[PDB]
Amino acid sequence: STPIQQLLEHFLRQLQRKDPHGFFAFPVTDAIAPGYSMIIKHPMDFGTMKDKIVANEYKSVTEFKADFKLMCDNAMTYNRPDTVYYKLAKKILHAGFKMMSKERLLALKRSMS
Amino acid sequence: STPIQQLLEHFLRQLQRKDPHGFFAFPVTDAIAPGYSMIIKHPMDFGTMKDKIVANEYKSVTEFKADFKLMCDNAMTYNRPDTVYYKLAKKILHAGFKMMSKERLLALKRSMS
Numbered sequence: 001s002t003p004i005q006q007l008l009e010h011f012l013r014q015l016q017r018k019d020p021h022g023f024f025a026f027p028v029t030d031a032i033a034p035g036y037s038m039i040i041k042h043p044m045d046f047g048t049m050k051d052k053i054v055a056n057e058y059k060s061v062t063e064f065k066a067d068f069k070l071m072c073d074n075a076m077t078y079n080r081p082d083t084v085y086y087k088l089a090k091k092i093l094h095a096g097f098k099m100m101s102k103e104r105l106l107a108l109k110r111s112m113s
Numbered sequence: 114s115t116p117i118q119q120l121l122e123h124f125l126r127q128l129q130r131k132d133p134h135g136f137f138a139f140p141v142t143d144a145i146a147p148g149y150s151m152i153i154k155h156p157m158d159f160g161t162m163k164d165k166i167v168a169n170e171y172k173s174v175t176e177f178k179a180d181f182k183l184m185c186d187n188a189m190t191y192n193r194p195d196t197v198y199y200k201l202a203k204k205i206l207h208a209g210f211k212m213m214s215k216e217r218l219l220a221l222k223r224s225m226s
C-alpha cells in the first residue's frame with residue numbers, strides 16, 4: 001500500500017462508522033428504488049469508493065471528498081426529507097466535511113515536514 | 114484514531130515488515146547482548162515507537178524519522194559489521210529514509226490539497 005491510500009482508508013472508515021446500518025454500503029439500483037437511474041445519474045456509494053482507493057484512482061483528498069459529497073447529494077435528492085435515508089445523508093455530510101476541513105487538512109499537512 | 118497516527122502506523126508497518134524475525138521489535142537486554150546498556154546511551158525499538166504513536170508523542174514525520182535513525186545507528190554501533198544485526202540495520206536505514214524522503218512527503222503533501 002501507499003500513504004495516500006492509507007489516509008483515504010482512515011477517512012472512509014470513520015465515515016462508515018456513522019452509517020452503522022449500511023444505507024450507503026452498496027449501489028442503489030432500480031431493482032430496489034423505482035425511477036432511481038433517471039433521478040440519480042451519477043450513483044456513488046461507500047463500496048465503490050473503497051474500490052477506487054484500492055485501485056489507487058484518487059489523486060487527492062479533494063477528489064475523495066467530491067465522491068463523498070456526491071453520494072450524500074444523491075441520497076438527499078432521491079429520498080424525501082422525512083425518510084431515514086435523507087436524514088442520515090444530511091448528518092454524515094456535515095460531519096464528513098468537518099473531519100476533512102481545509103483547516104484539519106492543513107494541520108495534518110504541517111506534520112509531514 | 115487520528116490521521117497522523119494512521120500515517121505513522123503505516124510507515125512503521127512497512128519498516129517492521131523488513132525485520133520478519135523481530136531483531137528490532139523489542140529492547141535489547143544486557144542478558145542477551147553483554148554490555149549493551151553501557152555502550153548504547155539511548156535505546157530504541159519498534160515497540161517503543163509504536164507506544165509513542167498510540168500515545169500521540171510524535172509531532173512530525175521528522176521526529177519519527179529521528180527515532181528510526183537512532184534505532185539503526187544503535188544497532189550498527191553495538192554490533193560488528195559481519196553480524197546479521199549490523200547488516201539489517203544498514204539496509205532498513207537506507208530503505209526507510211527513501212520511503213520517508215523529503216520528496217515523497219512533499220508529494221504526499223500536495224495530495225492532501
Ligand SMILES: CCN1/C(=C/C(C)=O)Sc2ccc(OC)cc21
Pocket residue numbers: 022023024025026028032033074075078079085
Ligand atoms: C441502500 C438503502 N436505501 C437507500 C439509500 C440511499 C443512500 O439512497 S435508497 C432506498 C430505497 C429503497 C430501499 O429498499 C427498501 C433501500 C434504500
Ligand SMILES: CCN1/C(=C/C(C)=O)Sc2ccc(OC)cc21
Pocket residue numbers: 135136137141145146187188191192198
Ligand atoms: C534481539 C537481536 N539482537 C540485536 C538487536 C539489535 C537491534 O541490535 S543485538 C543482539 C546481540 C546478541 C543477540 O543474541 C544472539 C541478539 C541481538
